[PDB]
Amino acid sequence: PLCLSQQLRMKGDYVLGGLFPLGEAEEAGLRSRTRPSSPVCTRFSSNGLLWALAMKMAVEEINNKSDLLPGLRLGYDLFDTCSEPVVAMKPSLMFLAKAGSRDIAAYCNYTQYQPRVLAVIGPHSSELAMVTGKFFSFFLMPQVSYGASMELLSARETFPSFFRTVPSDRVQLTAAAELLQEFGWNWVAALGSDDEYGRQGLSIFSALAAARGICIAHEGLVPLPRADDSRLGKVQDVLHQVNQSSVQVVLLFASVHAAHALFNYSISSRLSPKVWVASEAWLTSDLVMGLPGMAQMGTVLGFLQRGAQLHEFPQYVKTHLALATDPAFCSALGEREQGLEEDVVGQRCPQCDCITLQNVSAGLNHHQTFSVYAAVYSVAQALHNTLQCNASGCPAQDPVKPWQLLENMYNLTFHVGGLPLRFDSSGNVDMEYDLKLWVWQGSVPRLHDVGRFNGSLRTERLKIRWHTSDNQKPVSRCSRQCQEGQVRRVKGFHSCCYDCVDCEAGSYRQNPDDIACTFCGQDEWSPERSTRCFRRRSRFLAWGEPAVLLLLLLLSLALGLVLAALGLFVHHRDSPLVQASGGPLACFGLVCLGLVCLSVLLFPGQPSPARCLAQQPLSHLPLTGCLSTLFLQAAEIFVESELPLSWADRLSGCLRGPWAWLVVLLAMLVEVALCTWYLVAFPPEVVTDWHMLPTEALVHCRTRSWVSFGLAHATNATLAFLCFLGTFLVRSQPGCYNRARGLTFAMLAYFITWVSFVPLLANVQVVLRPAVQMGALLLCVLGILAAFHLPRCYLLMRQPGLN
Template identity: 25%
Template sequence: MRMRLKARLYWCIWHLVIFYFIPPSYGNDIPCNLSLSELSVILEPGDILIGVLLPFHIDKTFLKISFTETPPTVSCTRFLLETYQQFQAMRFALDEINKSPTLLPNVTLGFYVYDSCANLRKEQEGTLWMLTGMNKTVPNYCCQEWPRLAAVLGHSVSTYSILMAHILGLYRYPQISHYSTSSSLSDRSQFPSFFRTVPSDAFQSRGLAHLLLYFGWTWVGLVGMGSDYGEQGVYLITQELIKAGACVAFTGFILSNREDKNVPYLTRIIKESTARVIVVFAPDIYFAALLDELLKQNLTGKIFVASEAWSISSMLSAEKYSSALTGAIGFAFSSSPLPGLRGFLNKVRPSNTPGQTITKIFWENIFKCKFMDQGNLTGTWIDSTKLCTGKEDLEMVESSYNDVSNLRSSYSIYTSIQILARSLHNLFSCWNGKETLSGGTCVDAKNFKPWQLTHYIQNAHVKLSNGREVSFDINGDLPAVYDIVNWQLRADGTMKQVKVGSYDTADTNGNIFSINISAVMWAPGDHQVPSSVCSKSCPPGFRRAVIRGQPICCFQCVPCPYGEISNKSGSNECSKCPWNMWPNVDKDRCVPKATDFLSFEEPLGTTLTAATITSSLVPLSVLGLYYCYRSTPIVRANNYSLSCTLLVSLTLCFLCSLSFIGCPQQLKCFLRQVAFGMVFTLCVSCILAKTIMVVLAFMATKPGSSLKKWTGPRVSYIIVSICNILQLCLCICWLSLFPPFPEYNTDTQPEIIIIVCNEGSTIAFWCMLGYLGLLATISFIVAFLARHLPESFNEARFITFSMLSFLTVWISFIPASLSTRGQYIVAMEVFAILSSSWALLVCMFLPKCFIIVFRPNLNSREHLIRRARN
């Protein structure tokens, strides 16, 4: 293996040595010579020459190649008036420069212009011919010492420019393209001397993606030319669309090397696709073949988005394409006027213009005539053919040639010439203190090298006629500026490309993308922006759910989950409402949550309020009754003062339930349980004191009892005070350490805010309630044990029933409170307060009131003594 590699290395070195030492005079005998086909060359002499490759013809006849003989000459068939305008715009720029006393004084610029016919073979021939400087091209040799070839302008097809750039880059010959947009050409490692005065497709792809997303077109088809231009354009815009969340429905390519150009396949996938918008990266001549097939199959209703390659095509503006292209929109190179150009164009004559052959072809095309001496320039001669004189007036003709309203490619080639001239001027002015090379040295103007001019082009700054200053960036690109054009139908059936916006990456105000949507006209039948989506946008209240195996743009709409909303169309996700809000029925907005508390206005709250107020009047009525009959035996026998205290406390018990009704607030939450605990402690402690006093009074009646001194009213007050002080201490500790506060509960029912009072400390609350239960239990036990005392002095049975009722109510409240939420737990506590209060009131005072009111005869001392004796 090592010997084989060494042999190959020697073989390569030997061939290089032989090639180096063979003089160019033997060029005709070198087998690798390239023999050129017939050249279409226009020469304008000058001190320095500029090589230009222009495709005056865009179409060609395909001939079969046998590979056994020299390939036949390429036959060009379709002449382009637009290219001839570019040629004259180049002459116009050179005429300005050669006449300028300040720019390149005493130096005349000339040119080679070669008709490449948009053919790869002729493109290579023309490039090598310009480098060699002779009819026979010899690689690696230049046989023309003067005038020097300064730079090469071209080509208009990215693939051919890439081929040129590979060749010219070997010698660092500067190449400036006015139409090649492939992003690959920005790679300085591969193309070190390539420049262009049109934006890279990388900018156009971002702009087109921005345009598609602006109109909401997320489901689009892509058709490209099967070349570097089309393939890279499709790739770049695909990446931009995917990055933005849009999808590509299909991708297809027009193949120029096939006779049918792949049109049947493209027509089929366009017909089957649901995508209504199609982006086309292809020159007009190739796109026309696809349009012809679409129209043949009556396939309309699509919206075409144009790349700069066909966005202002005069060929596609014909009436026959109006049904397919009306409403199309796309990017075009920025246009700018060139004062004086139209007059220059209209002065052209076959007799006064370089390149008579090309000019006569142009003349025959624009005036639809033929020259007598060259009747076969553009077709066969027949008797009815109009004769060309060469003196026809171009002012009388309106065509794409002398239409200077939207100069784009012509302005681009004009810019190329201006930049090249400024670079040469800087190079020749080096000795006068102007810009130098990187080493600080100057260049001999008569012997400058190609790479030296490349340096000056890279650093050139030129102010154009529209006031815009341009310079190349490190990749040889100018700032990207596009016009957004809309294809609108004229009254005569043809179409006009109307500027409706712009895309300017160099805009200093940050307004890169702008469009006047009111100026855009869509196809007939579309009164608003057409839609092109795989799935219709989900309405508010729904979110997108991706369908398995489908692109992300194809989805189904599912309702937002419980508690979430989507307030705009096409939402990917639903969002939760704030804690105090809840989705409406349609789940498209959040509304304030309903609040839940025991309100005075609600029927339950109103009922309990009425019951509370009415109930509080009953013990006051009893108190009034007791006051009126305070001197009667039945009132005096049951400790009148303690009974009055009990009645007042019962009134407070009824009224304290009002603090549980209404919206919980800080002060209300702070006091209501404490108020409830204190008034009920007072009430139960009074009953406990009465119970104890009944027992003590009976025991003191026994002979020799020492308990008589404990039967005074002071003892009952001491009992009541001690019981209340203990409860008060507990409440003070509770309020000091863990004070209650309002709480907004959204966990129990997420759609409702339950406003409750958080007790602060559950232990403290149950301790307070437990203390009440303890007092009630002691009263119950004492009263139960004293139930057999003489009836005339005995309230024990009434106290027993009252405490039994009290305990039953509150013991039932405990499990009920653990299983109830919201206003109902508050209603239950109010009901327990009212029930237990009524139980105490009825059991303690109803029998006595009955006797006082309805049986006054029983309310006498004699009756009581009689009952005691019995």
């Protein structure tokens, strides 16, 4: 049976203390507490015994060493913690009982107290760290922990005797926050283990987010794998938030198990890859390195502790185990340690000690051993200084009390394996870190250095692959101090940062603070990103519109030609040809052209609803009268063309006099009648639309139905068509220009114009709709003269000349 428990104590002169997990308490006693007895920890652990052997190596080194603690040897009180305060507190109470006794007094003062150990090599588990440190603080016994990292343990008002190595979670969290700051990663969602480790780290990182500037997005926790299994569901929700927050960087301060569950689910759910700012609890553990498919989950990168490994340790461990096999040395040390506390140590059984060298020869190069080793040297040096010892001996006047160390352990400088470590006021040494990546090449994530951390980061982004494409660094930024114009929706778990949205067209912002693009009335005009509503300008059928000006010029031309023709008609009254072209009925027609000018001229300018009512009907009126004159002429010509003889004579007699003017005035009456009718049915009115175009308010003569106007025009148009049928059939006069053909060009062109501009009018835009309408009448009336009266003038100013 391997000789271990016998070696788990030594006499020395100023005995140290150890609180290590040389075992693992079975998961029954912890739940079954009905009798006051600590659970046994038969189950063996490897790293715990490695740490105990490291403490032993350090103590043997200092004892063997001459210049450090000359003449004074240090012992042990190796006691198990079993990673459980219930079973780890009895050894702690033992450490502070009395010199060579088993009773711990409760005197108000601790100055007169003389405990058994001089210091404690604090536990690993940080729950144990807190419980045992609370116990030790009052008695002021220097407790140096080798694995504790929770930041509260540095609170030197309730833990004044904690002197842990392995810097706290604070330092790695500051490194992570600094990395985010220098990589421009304001918008970060930080997760955490449900256990106290994760929550503590998350609180520290919230403080660091406030300080450095990065704005937290989602501050949740990832439940540990538990029998409830609702944990898994909860994870999804937490994971879902990471998807929803749109974050390419996530801080995972989870323990190894929590991160394992998180990443297993992330693979199983096909979660979008993102940067995973890791922690020392999972950044290298194989339980998260083995998961299939993990390589496709963004870049895992995190800060890992840097510190010389305790070399020449494997040889010592192998030699010590082998010598523990040797009966002679075991019996010798048993005889040396007789009747003393060599048995009360943990795992004191035979079998509890009977193991195989392979039972522990796995994590032989474990980074924690150094910490344990360092711890001993610390107290060694501390003791070496509190006795005021020097090279080659020292007076050692009186047994130094632990509070003497407490006084003379802060700001201590000790060299461990050539590393000059030094505690600070908070009691935690400051060791540097290195940014380990998780670069994948063959599904075996290799971790490599990017930059170091001496309290200030020294990264170099070039090395990180950054997954994605073209090794582009994932940008996860938050709109902070953004353009004032946009509306600002506050987001983030804290009020930090906000989303800025460009306002829409037609909606303005009352004040910068408000969080809505207010919508104002159509009277104003608001473009994109305008916190104000801008008044428009009126748009109408102004007299000054270029098209309106052209139409006015055309109306002036029409008036001129009408006046010329009617002057020729007032003069050439006796000439039979002028009369045969229509007589004073054609005088009515020419003045009707002038009057249709006087009628159509109401469109341009500022339109009034009354103008819309009274304009178009009186517009059709004079043109209707003149075209009725045209119809008289055409029907008379048609009747002449026909050959009934008696009917032709009767119609000529009837139509020469009374019927001509009677029909003219009847056409006038019909025009005004249908005008009143449509005005009752669909009277157009002036209306304003502000949404038709953004920057202007379109005030124009809206029409209830252009069909009504079409029919009002179609009255005279149908008269035109009737005369067109009457006149078109006429064959050219033998050896003379035909009279019917003048009327034929006239009405045929009139249709070609109005039948044509009704669709052109419909197609064109609303405000120019009256504009081209102007032209219609102009062109329309022009047509008549360009195809009815032009030959009449031609003759009149050439009739005397020809003969």
